[PDB]
Short mmCIF file of C-alpha atoms (C1' of nucleotides) and ligand atoms in Angstrom, two decimals:
data_model
loop_
_atom_site.label_atom_id
_atom_site.label_comp_id
_atom_site.label_asym_id
_atom_site.label_seq_id
_atom_site.Cartn_x
_atom_site.Cartn_y
_atom_site.Cartn_z
CA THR A 1 0.00 0.00 0.00
CA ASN A 2 1.28 3.47 -0.63
CA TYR A 3 1.27 4.36 3.12
CA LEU A 4 3.41 1.35 4.10
CA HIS A 5 6.00 2.56 1.60
CA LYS A 6 5.79 6.15 2.87
CA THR A 7 6.21 5.03 6.49
CA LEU A 8 8.96 2.45 5.88
CA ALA A 9 11.11 4.55 3.51
CA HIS A 10 10.79 8.32 3.93
CA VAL A 11 10.15 8.95 7.67
CA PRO A 12 13.72 9.70 8.88
CA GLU A 13 14.29 12.17 6.04
CA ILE A 14 10.94 13.87 6.75
CA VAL A 15 11.54 14.28 10.50
CA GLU A 16 15.05 15.54 9.72
CA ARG A 17 13.98 18.16 7.14
CA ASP A 18 11.46 20.03 9.31
CA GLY A 19 11.67 18.41 12.74
CA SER A 20 8.09 17.20 13.15
CA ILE A 21 5.34 15.21 11.48
CA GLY A 22 2.25 15.09 13.67
CA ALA A 23 2.33 18.84 14.23
CA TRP A 24 1.59 19.42 10.52
CA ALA A 25 -1.18 16.81 10.31
CA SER A 26 -4.57 17.44 8.71
CA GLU A 27 -6.33 17.13 12.11
CA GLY A 28 -7.04 20.85 12.32
CA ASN A 29 -9.27 20.83 9.26
CA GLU A 30 -10.86 17.40 9.70
CA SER A 31 -11.99 18.37 13.20
CA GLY A 32 -13.02 21.86 12.11
CA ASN A 33 -15.54 20.15 9.83
CA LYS A 34 -17.46 19.32 13.02
CA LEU A 35 -17.69 23.03 13.78
CA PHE A 36 -18.80 23.66 10.19
CA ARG A 37 -21.70 21.25 10.54
CA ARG A 38 -22.78 22.59 13.92
CA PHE A 39 -22.59 26.18 12.58
CA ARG A 40 -24.59 25.42 9.42
CA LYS A 41 -27.34 23.86 11.51
CA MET A 42 -27.53 26.14 14.57
CA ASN A 43 -25.93 29.52 13.79
CA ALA A 44 -26.58 30.49 10.19
CA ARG A 45 -29.46 32.09 8.32
CA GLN A 46 -31.58 29.42 6.69
CA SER A 47 -31.22 30.52 3.08
CA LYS A 48 -29.04 29.56 0.12
CA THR A 49 -27.92 33.15 -0.49
CA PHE A 50 -26.73 34.36 2.92
CA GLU A 51 -25.79 31.25 4.90
CA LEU A 52 -22.18 30.75 3.79
CA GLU A 53 -21.49 34.29 5.00
CA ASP A 54 -22.86 33.53 8.47
CA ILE A 55 -20.95 30.26 8.83
CA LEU A 56 -17.76 32.04 7.76
CA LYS A 57 -18.21 34.94 10.21
CA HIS A 58 -19.16 32.80 13.21
CA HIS A 59 -16.40 30.30 12.53
CA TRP A 60 -13.89 33.14 12.34
CA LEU A 61 -15.13 34.45 15.69
CA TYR A 62 -14.92 31.04 17.40
CA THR A 63 -11.26 30.63 16.44
CA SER A 64 -9.86 33.93 17.75
CA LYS A 65 -7.33 34.09 20.58
CA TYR A 66 -8.49 37.41 22.01
CA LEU A 67 -11.93 35.96 22.79
CA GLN A 68 -10.38 32.75 24.16
CA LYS A 69 -8.34 34.74 26.69
CA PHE A 70 -11.52 35.36 28.72
CA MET A 71 -12.52 31.68 29.00
CA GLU A 72 -9.94 31.17 31.75
CA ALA A 73 -9.89 34.75 33.13
CA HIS A 74 -6.90 33.89 35.34
CA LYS A 75 -8.60 30.79 36.78
CA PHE B 1 6.60 31.24 4.98
CA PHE B 2 3.86 28.88 3.78
CA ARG B 3 3.85 25.09 4.10
CA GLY B 4 0.92 23.27 2.56
CA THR B 5 0.69 20.00 4.50
CA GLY B 6 -2.94 19.44 5.46
CA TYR B 7 -3.96 17.60 2.30
CA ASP B 8 -4.96 13.95 1.97
CA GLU B 9 -3.41 11.85 -0.81
CA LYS B 10 -6.39 12.16 -3.16
CA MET B 11 -6.03 15.94 -3.14
CA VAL B 12 -2.21 15.88 -3.10
CA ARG B 13 -2.32 13.86 -6.32
CA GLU B 14 -5.03 16.04 -7.88
CA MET B 15 -3.30 19.34 -7.11
CA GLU B 16 0.03 18.07 -8.49
CA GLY B 17 -1.24 16.35 -11.64
CA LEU B 18 -0.10 12.83 -10.75
CA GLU B 19 -2.50 9.97 -11.39
CA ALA B 20 -4.34 8.56 -8.42
CA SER B 21 -4.36 6.41 -6.59
CA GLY B 22 -4.07 2.71 -7.30
CA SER B 23 -1.50 3.63 -9.92
CA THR B 24 1.79 1.93 -10.70
CA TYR B 25 3.64 4.89 -9.15
CA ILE B 26 2.90 4.70 -5.44
CA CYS B 27 4.99 7.39 -3.77
CA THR B 28 4.24 11.09 -3.98
CA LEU B 29 7.85 11.80 -2.95
CA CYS B 30 9.76 9.07 -4.83
CA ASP B 31 9.77 7.62 -8.34
CA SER B 32 9.61 3.89 -7.63
CA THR B 33 6.86 1.77 -9.12
CA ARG B 34 4.94 -0.90 -7.24
CA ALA B 35 7.48 -3.58 -8.17
CA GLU B 36 10.64 -1.74 -7.08
CA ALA B 37 8.89 -0.74 -3.84
CA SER B 38 7.82 -4.28 -2.98
CA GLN B 39 11.34 -5.53 -3.79
CA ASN B 40 13.44 -3.08 -1.73
CA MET B 41 11.23 -1.56 0.95
CA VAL B 42 13.55 0.57 3.09
CA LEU B 43 15.92 2.40 0.70
CA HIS B 44 14.70 5.47 -1.20
CA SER B 45 15.33 9.23 -1.45
CA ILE B 46 12.87 12.12 -1.81
CA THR B 47 12.90 13.65 -5.31
CA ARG B 48 9.45 15.02 -6.26
CA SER B 49 8.70 18.73 -5.86
CA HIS B 50 6.74 21.46 -7.64
CA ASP B 51 9.23 22.81 -10.18
CA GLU B 52 10.34 19.44 -11.53
CA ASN B 53 6.68 18.44 -11.92
CA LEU B 54 5.98 21.56 -14.00
CA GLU B 55 8.99 20.74 -16.17
CA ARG B 56 7.89 17.11 -16.54
CA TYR B 57 4.43 18.20 -17.70
CA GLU B 58 6.24 20.32 -20.27
CA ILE B 59 8.18 17.26 -21.45
CA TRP B 60 5.03 15.12 -21.65
CA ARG B 61 3.24 17.80 -23.69
CA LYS B 62 5.92 18.90 -26.17
CA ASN B 63 7.19 15.27 -26.42
CA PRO B 64 10.54 16.04 -28.11
CA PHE B 65 11.61 12.42 -28.79
CA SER B 66 8.43 11.09 -30.50
CA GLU B 67 8.00 8.30 -27.97
CA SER B 68 5.02 5.98 -27.69
CA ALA B 69 2.40 6.68 -25.03
CA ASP B 70 3.19 3.76 -22.70
CA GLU B 71 6.93 4.48 -22.64
CA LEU B 72 6.64 8.28 -22.48
CA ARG B 73 4.53 7.72 -19.36
CA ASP B 74 7.48 5.89 -17.79
CA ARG B 75 10.00 8.51 -18.94
CA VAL B 76 7.93 11.31 -17.36
CA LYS B 77 7.18 9.12 -14.30
CA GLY B 78 3.45 9.70 -13.96
CA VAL B 79 3.03 13.41 -14.71
CA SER B 80 -0.02 13.53 -17.00
CA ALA B 81 -1.38 16.94 -15.95
CA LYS B 82 -0.07 20.38 -15.12
CA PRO B 83 0.48 21.10 -11.40
CA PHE B 84 -1.92 23.71 -10.03
CA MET B 85 -0.55 24.43 -6.53
CA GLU B 86 2.67 23.91 -4.58
CA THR B 87 2.59 21.60 -1.56
CA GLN B 88 5.53 20.83 0.71
CA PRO B 89 6.75 17.21 0.29
CA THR B 90 5.47 15.72 3.57
CA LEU B 91 3.44 12.81 4.91
CA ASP B 92 0.00 13.16 6.47
CA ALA B 93 -0.22 11.62 9.93
CA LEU B 94 -3.86 10.70 10.48
CA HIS B 95 -4.59 8.98 7.19
CA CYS B 96 -1.26 7.13 7.52
CA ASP B 97 -2.35 5.70 10.86
CA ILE B 98 -5.70 4.77 9.28
CA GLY B 99 -4.04 3.05 6.31
CA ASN B 100 -1.76 1.00 8.52
CA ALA B 101 -4.68 0.05 10.80
CA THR B 102 -6.75 -1.20 7.86
CA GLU B 103 -3.69 -3.12 6.63
CA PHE B 104 -3.24 -4.95 9.95
CA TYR B 105 -7.00 -5.54 10.12
CA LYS B 106 -6.77 -7.31 6.76
CA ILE B 107 -3.69 -9.25 7.90
CA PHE B 108 -5.49 -10.48 11.01
CA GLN B 109 -8.43 -11.58 8.88
CA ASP B 110 -6.13 -13.61 6.64
CA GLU B 111 -4.53 -15.12 9.71
CA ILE B 112 -7.67 -16.30 11.46
CA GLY B 113 -8.15 -18.80 8.68
CA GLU B 114 -5.17 -20.41 7.00
CA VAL B 115 -4.39 -18.24 3.98
CA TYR B 116 -0.83 -19.36 3.25
CA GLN B 117 -1.79 -23.05 3.15
CA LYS B 118 -4.87 -22.76 0.91
CA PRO B 119 -4.01 -19.80 -1.35
CA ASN B 120 -7.43 -19.56 -3.07
CA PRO B 121 -10.36 -19.10 -0.67
CA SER B 122 -13.90 -18.05 -1.54
CA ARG B 123 -16.04 -15.10 -0.45
CA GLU B 124 -17.93 -17.34 1.99
CA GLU B 125 -14.87 -18.14 4.10
CA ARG B 126 -13.74 -14.51 3.87
CA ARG B 127 -17.03 -13.34 5.39
CA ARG B 128 -16.87 -16.09 8.02
CA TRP B 129 -13.33 -15.14 9.06
CA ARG B 130 -14.30 -11.46 9.26
CA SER B 131 -17.37 -12.32 11.33
CA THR B 132 -15.45 -14.40 13.87
CA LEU B 133 -12.77 -11.69 14.04
CA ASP B 134 -15.32 -9.00 14.82
CA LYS B 135 -17.07 -11.19 17.41
CA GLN B 136 -13.78 -11.94 19.18
CA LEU B 137 -12.69 -8.28 19.09
CA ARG B 138 -16.05 -7.16 20.51
CA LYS B 139 -16.00 -9.77 23.29
CA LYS B 140 -12.63 -8.65 24.69
CA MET B 141 -11.38 -5.34 23.26
CA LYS B 142 -14.88 -3.76 23.43
CA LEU B 143 -15.01 -2.67 19.78
CA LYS B 144 -18.16 -2.82 17.68
CA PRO B 145 -17.54 -3.40 13.96
CA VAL B 146 -16.91 -0.45 11.67
CA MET B 147 -18.18 0.52 8.25
CA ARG B 148 -14.97 2.47 7.55
CA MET B 149 -11.79 2.73 9.63
CA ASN B 150 -12.01 6.01 11.55
CA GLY B 151 -9.09 7.34 13.57
CA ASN B 152 -10.28 6.26 17.02
CA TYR B 153 -10.83 2.62 16.08
CA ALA B 154 -7.32 2.79 14.60
CA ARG B 155 -5.84 3.96 17.90
CA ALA C 1 -21.87 29.95 -12.46
CA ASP C 2 -23.72 27.28 -10.42
CA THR C 3 -21.24 27.35 -7.52
CA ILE C 4 -21.92 29.48 -4.43
CA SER C 5 -18.82 30.51 -2.50
CA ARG C 6 -17.60 32.99 0.10
CA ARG C 7 -14.11 33.97 1.13
CA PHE C 8 -12.04 36.65 2.77
CA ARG C 9 -9.18 38.22 0.90
CA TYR C 10 -5.99 36.41 1.81
CA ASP C 11 -3.76 39.25 3.04
CA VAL C 12 -6.57 40.91 5.02
CA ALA C 13 -7.44 37.77 6.97
CA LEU C 14 -3.70 37.23 7.43
CA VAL C 15 -3.10 40.64 9.02
CA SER C 16 -6.19 40.35 11.21
CA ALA C 17 -5.38 36.86 12.52
CA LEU C 18 -1.79 38.08 13.03
CA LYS C 19 -2.65 41.26 14.92
CA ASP C 20 -4.95 39.15 17.11
CA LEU C 21 -1.83 37.39 18.47
CA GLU C 22 -0.21 40.72 19.41
CA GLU C 23 -0.81 40.01 23.11
CA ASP C 24 1.21 36.79 23.06
CA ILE C 25 3.87 38.12 20.66
CA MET C 26 4.62 41.05 22.97
CA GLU C 27 4.53 38.79 26.03
CA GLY C 28 7.07 36.53 24.34
CA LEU C 29 9.18 39.59 23.56
CA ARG C 30 9.15 40.54 27.26
CA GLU C 31 9.78 36.98 28.48
CA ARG C 32 12.87 36.59 26.31
CA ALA C 33 13.73 40.15 27.48
CA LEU C 34 14.64 41.23 23.95
CA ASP C 35 14.94 44.85 22.84
CA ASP C 36 11.64 46.46 21.86
CA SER C 37 12.30 49.71 20.05
CA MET C 38 15.22 47.86 18.44
CA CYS C 39 14.93 44.75 16.25
CA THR C 40 11.51 45.55 14.81
CA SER C 41 11.99 44.47 11.17
CA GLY C 42 13.37 40.97 11.65
CA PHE C 43 10.26 38.89 12.24
CA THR C 44 9.47 35.60 10.46
CA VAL C 45 6.09 33.78 10.42
CA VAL C 46 5.58 30.11 9.54
CA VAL C 47 2.00 29.25 8.56
CA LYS C 48 0.43 25.82 7.99
CA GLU C 49 -2.46 25.80 5.50
CA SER C 50 -4.87 22.96 4.84
CA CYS C 51 -7.60 22.02 2.37
CA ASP C 52 -10.34 19.42 2.59
CA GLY C 53 -13.70 18.34 1.21
CA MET C 54 -16.84 17.03 2.85
CA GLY C 55 -19.62 14.70 1.75
CA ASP C 56 -23.41 14.60 2.15
CA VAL C 57 -23.92 18.25 2.99
CA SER C 58 -27.66 18.56 2.39
CA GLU C 59 -28.94 21.41 0.25
CA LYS C 60 -31.94 23.76 0.52
CA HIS C 61 -34.80 24.85 -1.75
CA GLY C 62 -34.03 28.59 -1.82
CA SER C 63 -34.37 30.34 -5.18
CA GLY C 64 -31.33 28.99 -7.06
CA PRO C 65 -28.98 28.24 -8.54
CA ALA C 66 -28.86 24.44 -8.20
CA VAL C 67 -25.84 23.28 -6.21
CA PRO C 68 -24.13 19.92 -5.54
CA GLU C 69 -24.13 18.34 -2.10
CA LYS C 70 -20.35 18.19 -1.58
CA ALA C 71 -18.70 21.19 0.08
CA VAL C 72 -15.02 22.21 0.14
CA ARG C 73 -13.31 24.20 2.89
CA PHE C 74 -9.90 25.91 2.64
CA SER C 75 -8.39 27.05 5.92
CA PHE C 76 -5.05 28.17 7.36
CA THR C 77 -3.36 28.29 10.77
CA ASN D 1 -34.41 26.19 27.82
CA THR D 2 -31.27 27.52 26.09
CA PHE D 3 -29.90 24.01 25.36
CA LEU D 4 -26.75 24.78 27.36
CA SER D 5 -24.70 21.74 28.31
CA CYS D 6 -23.78 21.34 31.98
CA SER D 7 -20.06 21.75 31.31
CA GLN D 8 -20.68 24.77 29.07
CA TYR D 9 -22.87 26.28 31.80
CA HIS D 10 -20.14 25.74 34.40
CA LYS D 11 -17.75 27.46 32.00
CA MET D 12 -20.15 30.41 31.78
CA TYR D 13 -20.48 30.49 35.58
CA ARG D 14 -16.73 30.50 36.20
CA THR D 15 -16.16 33.22 33.59
CA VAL D 16 -18.95 35.46 34.90
CA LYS D 17 -17.76 35.10 38.51
CA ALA D 18 -14.02 35.53 37.94
CA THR D 19 -14.47 38.86 36.10
CA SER D 20 -16.03 41.56 38.33
CA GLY D 21 -18.01 39.03 40.37
CA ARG D 22 -20.12 39.68 42.37
CA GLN D 23 -21.31 36.24 41.26
CA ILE D 24 -24.80 36.01 39.77
CA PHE D 25 -25.38 32.46 38.55
CA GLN D 26 -25.65 29.56 40.97
CA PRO D 27 -23.10 26.71 41.01
CA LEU D 28 -23.90 23.28 39.61
CA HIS D 29 -24.28 21.39 42.90
CA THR D 30 -27.16 23.65 43.96
CA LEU D 31 -28.93 23.09 40.64
CA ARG D 32 -28.60 19.30 40.99
CA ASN D 33 -30.78 19.50 44.16
CA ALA D 34 -32.97 22.19 42.70
CA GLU D 35 -34.93 19.96 40.32
CA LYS D 36 -35.61 17.09 42.75
CA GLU D 37 -39.18 18.45 42.86
CA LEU D 38 -39.71 18.65 39.08
CA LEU D 39 -38.73 15.02 38.36
CA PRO D 40 -41.11 12.15 39.19
CA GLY D 41 -41.13 10.28 42.46
CA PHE D 42 -41.37 13.29 44.78
CA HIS D 43 -44.98 14.18 45.56
CA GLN D 44 -47.18 11.93 47.67
CA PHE D 45 -50.19 10.41 45.91
CA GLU D 46 -52.55 7.49 46.26
CA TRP D 47 -55.14 5.63 44.22
CA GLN D 48 -58.40 4.11 45.35
CA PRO D 49 -59.18 1.34 45.06
CA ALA D 50 -55.56 0.15 45.09
CA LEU D 51 -54.28 -0.53 41.59
CA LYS D 52 -53.97 -4.08 40.27
CA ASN D 53 -50.52 -5.61 39.76
CA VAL D 54 -48.79 -2.27 40.54
CA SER D 55 -46.74 -1.64 43.67
CA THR D 56 -47.74 1.21 45.98
CA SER D 57 -44.29 2.78 46.42
CA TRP D 58 -44.59 6.38 45.28
CA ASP D 59 -40.87 7.26 45.08
CA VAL D 60 -39.74 5.04 42.18
CA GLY D 61 -37.58 7.14 39.87
CA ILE D 62 -35.96 6.01 36.63
CA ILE D 63 -36.52 2.23 36.42
CA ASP D 64 -34.81 -0.02 33.88
CA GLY D 65 -37.36 -1.20 31.34
CA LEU D 66 -36.15 -4.79 31.17
CA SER D 67 -38.31 -5.27 34.28
CA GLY D 68 -36.44 -8.20 35.81
CA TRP D 69 -35.25 -10.28 32.85
CA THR D 70 -33.47 -13.46 33.95
CA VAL D 71 -30.45 -12.65 31.76
CA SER D 72 -29.19 -16.24 32.13
CA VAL D 73 -27.82 -17.61 28.88
CA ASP D 74 -30.18 -20.44 27.96
CA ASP D 75 -33.37 -18.34 27.64
CA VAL D 76 -34.17 -15.66 25.07
CA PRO D 77 -31.39 -13.13 25.78
"C1'" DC E 1 15.15 85.36 18.53
"C1'" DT E 2 17.54 81.99 22.11
"C1'" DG E 3 19.23 80.50 26.89
"C1'" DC E 4 18.67 80.52 32.10
"C1'" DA E 5 16.98 82.42 36.63
"C1'" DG E 6 14.81 85.18 40.88
"C1'" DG E 7 10.09 85.33 41.65
"C1'" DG E 8 4.86 85.15 40.46
"C1'" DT E 9 0.62 82.65 39.39
"C1'" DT E 10 -2.70 78.74 40.70
"C1'" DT E 11 -2.72 74.25 41.85
"C1'" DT E 12 -1.36 70.15 43.96
"C1'" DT E 13 0.51 66.72 47.91
"C1'" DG E 14 1.00 66.02 52.19
"C1'" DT E 15 1.24 66.58 57.04
"C1'" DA E 16 -0.53 68.32 60.39
"C1'" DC E 17 -4.63 68.84 65.14
"C1'" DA E 18 -8.73 65.94 66.67
"C1'" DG E 19 -13.12 62.42 67.09
"C1'" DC E 20 -14.98 57.92 65.24
"C1'" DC E 21 -17.09 54.07 62.09
"C1'" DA E 22 -16.14 49.78 59.14
"C1'" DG E 23 -14.19 45.86 58.51
"C1'" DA E 24 -10.16 42.35 59.52
"C1'" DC E 25 -8.16 39.54 63.22
"C1'" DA E 26 -8.80 34.76 66.46
"C1'" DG E 27 -11.52 30.87 67.03
"C1'" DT E 28 -14.54 27.06 66.76
"C1'" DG E 29 -17.09 23.11 65.55
"C1'" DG E 30 -18.54 21.78 61.95
"C1'" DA E 31 -21.27 22.67 57.46
"C1'" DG E 32 -21.88 23.23 53.57
"C1'" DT E 33 -19.28 25.46 51.17
"C1'" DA E 34 -16.90 25.15 46.23
"C1'" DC E 35 -13.56 23.27 43.33
"C1'" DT E 36 -11.10 19.58 41.70
"C1'" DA E 37 -10.17 14.53 39.87
"C1'" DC E 38 -11.88 10.03 37.96
"C1'" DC E 39 -14.47 7.31 34.43
"C1'" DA E 40 -15.08 5.33 29.89
"C1'" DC E 41 -16.32 7.09 25.50
"C1'" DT E 42 -17.51 10.66 21.16
"C1'" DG E 43 -16.62 13.16 16.47
"C1'" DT E 44 -14.49 15.12 12.35
"C1'" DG E 45 -12.01 11.76 9.08
"C1'" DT E 46 -16.35 8.49 3.84
"C1'" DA E 47 -15.90 6.56 -3.95
"C1'" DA E 48 -14.10 6.31 -8.16
"C1'" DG E 49 -9.98 4.72 -10.60
"C1'" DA E 50 -5.93 1.69 -11.93
"C1'" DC E 51 -4.55 -2.99 -13.71
"C1'" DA E 52 -4.47 -7.90 -15.01
"C1'" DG E 53 -6.89 -11.73 -17.03
"C1'" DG E 54 -10.33 -14.04 -20.03
"C1'" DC E 55 -12.90 -13.99 -24.03
"C1'" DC E 56 -15.77 -12.76 -27.95
"C1'" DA E 57 -16.99 -10.71 -32.13
"C1'" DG E 58 -16.20 -8.88 -36.36
"C1'" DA E 59 -12.91 -8.26 -40.11
"C1'" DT E 60 -9.56 -10.76 -43.52
"C1'" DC E 61 -7.43 -14.35 -46.77
"C1'" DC F 1 1.99 9.68 20.69
"C1'" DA F 2 -5.52 14.73 18.69
"C1'" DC F 3 -8.56 17.23 21.91
"C1'" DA F 4 -12.35 19.53 23.96
"C1'" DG F 5 -15.58 17.72 25.81
"C1'" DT F 6 -20.00 14.65 29.16
"C1'" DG F 7 -22.44 14.38 33.71
"C1'" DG F 8 -22.30 12.26 38.27
"C1'" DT F 9 -19.69 10.88 42.53
"C1'" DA F 10 -16.11 11.00 46.20
"C1'" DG F 11 -12.69 14.01 48.52
"C1'" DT F 12 -10.33 17.88 49.93
"C1'" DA F 13 -10.27 22.55 50.82
"C1'" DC F 14 -11.99 26.29 52.08
"C1'" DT F 15 -15.04 29.59 53.51
"C1'" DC F 16 -18.10 30.69 56.01
"C1'" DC F 17 -23.33 30.41 60.17
"C1'" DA F 18 -22.61 32.48 66.06
"C1'" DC F 19 -20.64 34.22 70.34
"C1'" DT F 20 -16.03 38.69 71.57
"C1'" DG F 21 -12.72 42.46 72.23
"C1'" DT F 22 -9.20 44.80 69.74
"C1'" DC F 23 -7.08 46.81 66.30
"C1'" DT F 24 -5.95 49.89 61.98
"C1'" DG F 25 -7.38 52.46 58.12
"C1'" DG F 26 -9.77 56.37 56.65
"C1'" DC F 27 -13.49 59.84 57.01
"C1'" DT F 28 -14.17 65.24 58.78
"C1'" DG F 29 -13.82 71.45 60.31
"C1'" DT F 30 -8.66 74.88 58.35
"C1'" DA F 31 -3.70 75.69 58.66
"C1'" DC F 32 0.56 74.98 56.87
"C1'" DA F 33 4.12 74.12 53.60
"C1'" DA F 34 6.52 71.52 49.87
"C1'" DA F 35 6.27 70.30 45.15
"C1'" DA F 36 4.31 71.49 39.89
"C1'" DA F 37 4.69 73.55 35.84
"C1'" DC F 38 3.50 77.41 33.00
"C1'" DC F 39 3.89 82.31 32.70
"C1'" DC F 40 5.61 86.34 33.49
"C1'" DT F 41 9.55 89.29 33.75
"C1'" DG F 42 14.89 90.16 34.41
"C1'" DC F 43 19.52 90.09 32.80
"C1'" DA F 44 22.62 88.06 29.24
"C1'" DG F 45 24.37 85.74 24.00
"C1'" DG G 1 -14.85 -21.27 -43.50
"C1'" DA G 2 -10.42 -20.56 -40.24
"C1'" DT G 3 -7.85 -17.05 -37.91
"C1'" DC G 4 -6.54 -12.96 -35.57
"C1'" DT G 5 -6.66 -9.11 -32.96
"C1'" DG G 6 -8.89 -5.01 -30.56
"C1'" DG G 7 -11.89 -3.97 -27.36
"C1'" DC G 8 -15.35 -5.57 -23.84
"C1'" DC G 9 -15.84 -7.52 -19.16
"C1'" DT G 10 -14.94 -8.75 -14.48
"C1'" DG G 11 -12.43 -9.18 -10.32
"C1'" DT G 12 -9.04 -7.21 -7.07
"C1'" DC G 13 -6.37 -3.45 -4.97
"C1'" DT G 14 -5.90 1.72 -3.14
"C1'" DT G 15 -7.26 6.02 -1.11
"C1'" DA G 16 -11.57 7.92 0.27
CA1 CA H 1 -12.69 14.38 3.22
CA1 CA H 2 -11.17 13.94 1.20
ZN1 ZN H 3 8.89 6.68 -2.15
#
DNA sequence: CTGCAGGGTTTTTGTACAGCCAGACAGTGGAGTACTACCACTGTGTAAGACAGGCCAGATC
DNA sequence: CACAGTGGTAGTACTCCACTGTCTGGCTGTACAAAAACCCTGCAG
DNA sequence: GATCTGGCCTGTCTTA
């Protein structure tokens, strides 16, 4: 399979070039899809014209750091 | 500095023009076919990148030596389309774990029955081996069967 | 023109998501105790970007145009 | 009535108390005893004449529906 | 015009008398307080395309 | 060697219900001076 | 009427 080849031949060279593998994984987007589904069902206008704009705005607001600073509020 | 790494293999092959995905040329980073990668498993060097793929599409399109289709494909090493976007030459973690987990799941299935004694089984015995494997895994490891190998079942 | 799509401009979303981290970039500058007025032009940012598709996204009646079920999302970090 | 999960509500409570609180919302452990009246098996009641084939205990809460199945292997499982 | 220097302007910044309320301190015995860990387990990963073999059907001498 | 959750239970940690005296910090009537910072004017290039 | 070869067909493997 093509993954057995990739993982038995090219792994040392990969971890030497950059220094990491798992830190550049596709997890961030795969898991963000969950947020996309929950924002297209609960937080967007129910119309074909406007709704991509609402999902985009609310998903940009959920992923800010400045608004995540207040979730801890110094414990 | 941009590093495009969050693509799965389907999209890595689409965005770089290579043919996908059960092709003779298995590696996105190396030029070995299926045969030379089943022969020598652990010795290869990364070659593929963006600029050389552009140049190889040029060679496949101008075709300066008047070669036949099947042999020009081997000379250009799988570049049948023009690359559209540059992606760093890296491996994706999650789908790699999933591929290896489905590979061991198939190995275990072969093992339950005797596959290396009787080399030609039917679909009936294949379904029976899979069924007993899933029943045994559920009884002890606490894993219901899966339609498709998701990451958590692979951990 | 069947496809519906929405997107920020690249450089504008870049500068906004970069200025949002100004808190932590200045706190890292103070923690390392580096010079502030000095060494202002030597920064370097490394940015991972990802692309991905998604199946069986249901569609709605609306007013048009007709649209496929599959959706594609391009995002950066 | 706002479909807030318990852990999300505790997050809201901690954030609203840590900043300028002056805490408004109640903690979780006082909510968990607040609804013991709303759920079944709290008020006293009685039928007449006494019901047939039904026990008279008036405090039975969530009961498992299997209703005493003799899970032993040889029967219908 | 610039520069500095006695003093002015008004304004602050604080110490000064002197009486007096508001809340912390100690404590206690324990309560109920409130905040944490532990426990298994979830979701977002989701369809065509490549290749080898067998064979059949129509064109040719 | 994803990762942010999901609600209930047991445990620790603390912060309080009452009795008590004591203590410091900060409020109020003008008087009294030391700093503040421009602005004047005074004497000099 | 025999023969030959291109294309049709089906099963398996790969990532999803
Ligand atoms: Ca996908
Ligand atoms: Ca995909
Ligand atoms: Zn390779």
